[PDB]
Design a protein around this ligand. Structure first.
Ligand SMILES: Nc1nc2c(ncn2[C@@H]2O[C@@H]3COP(=O)(O)O[C@H]3[C@H]2O)c(=O)[nH]1
Ligand SMILES: Nc1nc2c(ncn2[C@@H]2O[C@@H]3COP(=O)(O)O[C@H]3[C@H]2O)c(=O)[nH]1
Ligand SMILES: [Cl-]
Ligand SMILES: [Cl-]
Ligand SMILES: [K+]
Ligand SMILES: [K+]
Ligand SMILES: [K+]
Lengths: 131, 130
């Protein structure tokens, strides 16, 4: 899908994390990432459910329903904890505003992790801080 | 007192209210009604009159639009009837057991004129939804 591919470049530009990727790995993730828009209030992922993908916020913000809610703005990522640990979602995440998201399925996530050990590390430490 | 102190811990779960200073926060904590709705139960029904709006504290709701919309903690719904004066545009049910906070019409009017920022969020989310 070509339309999806060329649109992904401007969306990927919104996520500073990918500034750490060379051209080849950028193409891989720009191929792998799916763009979606989530209306305000809508559940993106639900506590206790299985997680097969992780998300990057392009525009808007999400709300992690931890006892003290966590707002995540553009460039932020979530959903990595279930991918790393294999456990169900630890928290519900909803669109706080209408949200533009990029999602990464599990296989592509592991491919990004081997393709970039620096980014693997960031997901790793971030998931540790969050749990 | 019991309902009042319970609302403080429930209001924490709705980030929208972080836009509110202490004096308006208080009026709203005074005004909000807490309910737990069992899974599957109708919270509001399409075509019926709406005199209140809702904030999701815990659990999620399902908006019976042609393609259903699930709203999670922190989300709000029912504002469209309060703004437009029209009947509920959709049925909303508890998707799971749901902890809600509700606001009657008058206290919604109060929240809106007391927080123009929040009135605007309600306004432009309602237009998005419509
Ligand atoms: N449990 C938890 N999750 C958080 C926090 N901040 C952000 N999140 C994200 O919310 C996500 C919910 O689903 P996951 O368990 O996949 O991964 C979680 C994290 O990526 C936090 O403080 N605690
Ligand atoms: N009509 C409509 N209502 C929605 C949508 N998403 C959430 N809702 C909520 O569902 C509610 C049903 O009652 P209201 O019409 O009072 O207000 C509505 C909104 O707050 C949507 O996409 N369309
Ligand atoms: Cl919405
Ligand atoms: Cl909302
Ligand atoms: K950005
Ligand atoms: K949660
Ligand atoms: K009220």
């Amino acid at each position: 899908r070509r339309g999806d591919f060329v649109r992904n470049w401007q969306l990927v530009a919104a996520v500073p994390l990918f500034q750490k990727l060379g051209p080849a790995v950028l193409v891989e993730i720009v191929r792998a990432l799916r763009a979606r828009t989530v209306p305000a209030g809508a559940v993106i992922c639900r506590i206790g459910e299985p997680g097969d993908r992780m998300f990057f916020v392009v525009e808007g913000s999400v709300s992690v329903a931890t006892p003290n809610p966590v707002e995540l703005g553009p460039g932020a990522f979530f959903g990595e904890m279930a991918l790393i640990s294999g456990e169900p979602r630890s928290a519900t995440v909803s669109a706080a505003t209408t949200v533009s998201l990029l999602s990464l399925h599990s296989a592509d996530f592991q491919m990004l992790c081997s393709s970039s050990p620096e980014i693997a590390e960031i997901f790793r430490k971030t998931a540790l801080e969050r749990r």
